[PDB]
């Protein structure tokens, strides 16, 4: 039913339309898959002798442009560029770096690592190492390797218990914190395993994993661990809370809102929407409506997929 050549045509027309027909441009790209958008972009370049992304960059502006260009990139290219941007210039955008490095799976990170080097001619790890220091750097480096254990069929009950005690002994039960021990367990073990480990941890500790983290560390490192545990325990809820934070207050933290909507639209948006509505009483759709306007809002609402 999909027709790249045709979509590339309608978009060329929309762009040509006096004043630029954004509604049409949004209606198409926000209602197509990422793979389909890739075909449309190929069909386009052939018809115009110019890259689709490049054409939309000249034709669009503001937050809408940000949404659209992000959508034209493959998942790995998007993440790679968002990562680069988080480290660009002196200083670092810790939140963004953390959000991506903590939430992506091995398969995603492997591709990201590959695409990153091709795009920027340097390894993601090298840039991370240059932009970070201390335990925070250690954690971000280990997670970025994308070498976490795969979901096994056999539940390792003995390991689950030892990991829990180790986590407990490394923090709550000692002066200071054996951060390396925490980094090792939380980056190497499979997600299903760690979910069980965190439950077993509650059998030994009066405070769960998240609260333990708040008690033991601070700064970027504390932020990384909290984000990571959330992604392990309930990723869809993790994104729902970040979505809530980017819109709850004055204005909007557009960069966060956009990245999540673009990067999770084809992954688990349905679950994010469900967790969001359950926790906040109103739909994700509703919050986007109150915080954004114009073609930008319409674009985000399409990526949302519907109201709840
Ligand atoms: Ca217009
Ligand atoms: Ca522009
Ligand atoms: Ca930097
Ligand atoms: Ca900073
Ligand atoms: Ca301690
Ligand atoms: Ca703290
Ligand atoms: Ca707001």
Under 8 Å between Cβ of 14 and 29: no
CATH topology of domain 1-73: Annexin V; domain 1 (1.10.220)
Compute, in degrees rounded to 10, the torsion defined by CA atoms 42, 81, 232, 184: 130
Equal fold, 74-153 vs 154-234: yes
**CATH fold of the domain at 235-308:** Annexin V; domain 1 (1.10.220)
C-alpha of residue 28 to centroid of ligand 6, in Å? 46
Resolution in A: 2.1
Structure tokens at 159: 């390991």
In angstroms, what is the span from residue 32 Cα to ligand 4's centroid?
35
Q: How many angstroms does the Cα of residue 305 sit away from the middle of ligand 2?
A: 26
Please give the Cα distance from 19 to 17 (Å, whole number).
6
Measured between alpha carbons, how far is 168 from 208 in angstroms, rounded to an integer? Answer: 10
**Nearest listed ligand to the Cα of residue 98:** 4
154-234 carries CATH number 1.10.220.10: yes
What SS3 string covers the chain?
CCCHHHHHHHHHHHHHCCCCCHHHHHHHHCCCCHHHHHHHHHHHHHHHCCCHHHHHHHHCCHHHHHHHHHHHCCHHHHHHHHHHHHHCCCCCCHHHHHHHHHHCCHHHHHHHHHHHHHHHCCCHHHHHHHHCCHHHHHHHHHHHCCCCCCCCCCCCHHHHHHHHHHHHHHCCCCCCCCHHHHHHHHHHCCHHHHHHHHHHHHHHCCCCHHHHHHHHCCHHHHHHHHHHHHHHHHHHHHHHHHHHHHHHCCCCCHHHHHHHHHHHCCCCHHHHHHHHHHHHCCCHHHHHHHHCCHHHHHHHHHHHCCCC
Ligand 7 center–CA 302 separation, angstroms: 19
| N- to C-terminal Cα separation, the chain | 28
How many angstroms does the Cα of residue 16 sit away from the middle of ligand 1?
A: 10
Contact 45, 37 (CB under 8 A): no
289 C-alpha to center of ligand 7: Å?
10
Contact 76, 267 (CB under 8 A): no
Note every long-range contact of 5-10, with CB atoms under 8 Å and residues 24 or more positions apart, other chains counting.
5/43, 5/47, 7/32, 7/36, 7/40, 7/43, 8/40, 8/41, 8/43, 8/44, 8/47, 8/52, 9/47
Query: How far is residue 16 from each of residues 41, 43, 129, 298, measured CA to CA in Å?
Result: 16, 17, 45, 21
Burial of residue 152 (CB within 10 Å: 0-12, 13-18, 19+) is exposed
Q: List the chain domain ranges.
A: 1-73, 74-153, 154-234, 235-308
CB 272 within 8 A of CB 285: no
Architecture of domain 74-153: Orthogonal Bundle (1.10)
Q: How far apart (Å, rounded) are the C-alpha atoms in residues 265 and 261?
A: 6
């Amino acid at each position: 039913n999909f027709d790249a050549e045709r979509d590339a045509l309608n978009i060329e027309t929309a762009i040509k339309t006096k004043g630029v027909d954004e509604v049409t441009i949004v209606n198409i790209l926000t209602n197509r898959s990422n793979a389909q958008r890739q075909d449309i972009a190929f069909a386009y370049q052939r018809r115009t002798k110019k890259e689709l992304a490049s054409a939309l960059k000249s034709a669009l502006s503001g937050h809408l442009e940000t949404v659209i260009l992000g959508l034209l990139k493959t998942p790995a290219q998007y993440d790679a560029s968002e990562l680069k941007a988080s480290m660009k210039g002196l200083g670092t955008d810790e939140d963004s770096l953390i959000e991506i490095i903590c939430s992506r799976t091995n398969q995603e990170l492997q591709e990201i690592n590959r695409v990153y080097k091709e795009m920027y001619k340097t390894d993601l790890e090298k840039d991370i190492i240059s932009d970070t220091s201390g335990d925070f750097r250690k954690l971000m480096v280990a997670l970025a390797k994308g070498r976490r254990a795969e979901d096994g069929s056999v539940i390792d009950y003995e390991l689950i218990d030892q990991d829990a005690r180790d986590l407990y002994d490394a923090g709550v039960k000692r002066k200071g914190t054996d951060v390396p021990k925490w980094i090792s367990i939380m980056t190497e073990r499979s997600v299903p395993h760690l979910q069980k480990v965190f439950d077993r941890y509650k059998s030994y500790s009066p405070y769960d994993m998240l609260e333990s983290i708040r008690k033991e560390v601070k700064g970027d490192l504390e932020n990384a661990f909290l984000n990571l545990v959330q992604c392990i325990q309930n990723k869809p809820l993790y994104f729902a809370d970040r979505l809530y934070d980017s819109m709850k207050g004055k204005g909007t933290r557009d960069k966060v809102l956009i990245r999540i909507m673009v990067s999770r639209s084809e992954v688990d948006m349905l679950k994010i929407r469900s967790e969001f509505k359950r926790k906040y009483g109103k739909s994700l759709y509703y919050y986007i409506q109150q915080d954004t306007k114009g073609d930008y809002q319409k674009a985000l609402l399409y990526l949302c997929g519907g109201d709840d």
